[PDB]
Amino acid sequence: FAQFGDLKEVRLARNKKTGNSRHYGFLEFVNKEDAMIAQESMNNYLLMGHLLQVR
Amino acid sequence: APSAKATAAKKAVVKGTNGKKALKVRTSATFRLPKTLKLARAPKYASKAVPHYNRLDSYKVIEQPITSET
Secondary structure: OOOOOOOOEEEEEEOOOOOOEEEEEEEEOOOHHHHHHHHHHHOOOEOOOOEOOOO | OOOHHHHHHHHHHHHOOOOOOOOOOOOOOOOOOOOOOOOOOOOOOOOOOOOOOOOOOHHHHOOOOOOOOO
């Protein structure tokens, strides 16, 4: 997401015990528009066989 | 903001970076037929399969001597 912008901040959701991902996170890039276009681009994006939902 | 970086990235993910054209110089007002491959015949059969012989051999050319006085 440095492709989309120099980020304000990222955070990820792990478990606290034997810390591994609980499969979500948050970000601000700088801007409202940056967040909008990232969400619009990748709302229903597929990958290896999860798909992310972004809001 | 413009978010020019990020809309370039948008265009990238949505089109997949195959996004420019090789522009060809074209200077002639008229475009002409390209010069292409032109074989020669390989018949499976001959046209008549036997050459005709020498039509005009010498013994046939010369019919006669003249035997007149002049």
